[PDB]
Design an enzyme around this catalytic site. Structure first.
Site, PDB file in Angstrom:
ATOM      1  N   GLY B  29       0.777  -1.232   0.000  1.00 60.50           N
ATOM      2  CA  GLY B  29       0.000   0.000   0.000  1.00 60.50           C
ATOM      3  C   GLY B  29       0.810   1.285   0.000  1.00 60.50           C
ATOM      4  N   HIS B  47       6.454  -6.306  -5.858  1.00 59.16           N
ATOM      5  CA  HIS B  47       5.572  -5.294  -6.448  1.00 59.16           C
ATOM      6  C   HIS B  47       6.255  -3.923  -6.615  1.00 59.16           C
ATOM      7  CE1 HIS B  47       1.622  -2.816  -5.540  1.00 59.16           C
ATOM      8  NE2 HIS B  47       1.840  -2.861  -6.845  1.00 59.16           N
ATOM      9  N   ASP B  89       1.065  -5.236 -11.487  1.00 59.05           N
ATOM     10  CA  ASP B  89      -0.138  -5.256 -10.673  1.00 59.05           C
ATOM     11  C   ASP B  89      -0.800  -6.622 -10.704  1.00 59.05           C
ATOM     12  OD1 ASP B  89       0.287  -2.600 -10.004  1.00 59.05           O
ATOM     13  OD2 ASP B  89      -1.343  -1.785 -11.228  1.00 59.05           O
TER      14      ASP B  89
END
Ligand SMILES: O=C(O)/C=C/c1ccc(O)cc1
Lengths: 121, 121
Positions: B29, B47, B89
């Site tokens: 996040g 990521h 993603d």
């Protein structure tokens, strides 16, 4: 630090601080400020403007002493910057409890990158 | 962007993306990387390292096209950066889903400033 701030919010609101205010609106929690979405958000707006007046202590990581006395946040001795920091945190915890009545969960996990830019403090 | 990323995570994991992953551990996040707390966290580490080459576009704000076909994320054509961004993603959404077995809520609203520094990408 985030530890004191979080305890303060829990004590005033009775709500899980991280869950309710960790990413609320454009101003509460992580990252900087944006155009406030509502009253709760504006609390955190003022809160982060309060931080900009500090003189070198770390609002995220510096611990400080305070007590929950007669259900009131009382900032302890500390040094001047920590004292001011503790007052910044006390102010936003109080403000968040005062504005529980318009708390909107739709702002709870707000995508802050799309927030409109905030005015200067 | 976060809209596509969040939809991928929702489709793969079945979970509210912002709530479960918006602030998970040291890596998922908001903000940057940290030493991973677990496998879920390490997904987001990979990521964000995947993101470091995308200097030609904005992983938070740039929209792209993808479809959910036969319970599979299929990235649409797009230009080189957006295509790669889509694949970053897709890969984290998959990884998050694969590691649901060890998802720990104690890391859900992790206080990231106290995270240890991450290894370079
Ligand atoms: O309010 C919360 O913190 C969490 C609720 C929740 C809902 C579904 C889950 O799988 C885990 C937590």
């Amino acid at each position: 630090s985030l530890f004191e701030l979080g305890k303060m919010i829990l004590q005033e609101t009775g709500k899980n601080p991280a869950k309710s205010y960790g990413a609320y609106g454009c101003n509460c929690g992580v990252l900087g400020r944006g155009q406030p979405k509502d009253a709760t958000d504006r609390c955190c707006y003022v809160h982060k403007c309060c931080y900009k007046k500090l003189t070198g202590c770390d609002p995220k990581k510096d611990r400080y002493s305070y007590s929950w006395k007669d259900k009131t946040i009382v900032c302890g001795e500390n040094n001047p910057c920590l004292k001011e920091l503790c007052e910044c945190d006390k102010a936003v915890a109080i403000c968040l409890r005062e504005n529980l009545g318009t708390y909107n969960k739709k702002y709870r996990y707000h995508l802050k990158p799309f927030c409109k830019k905030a005015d200067p403090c």
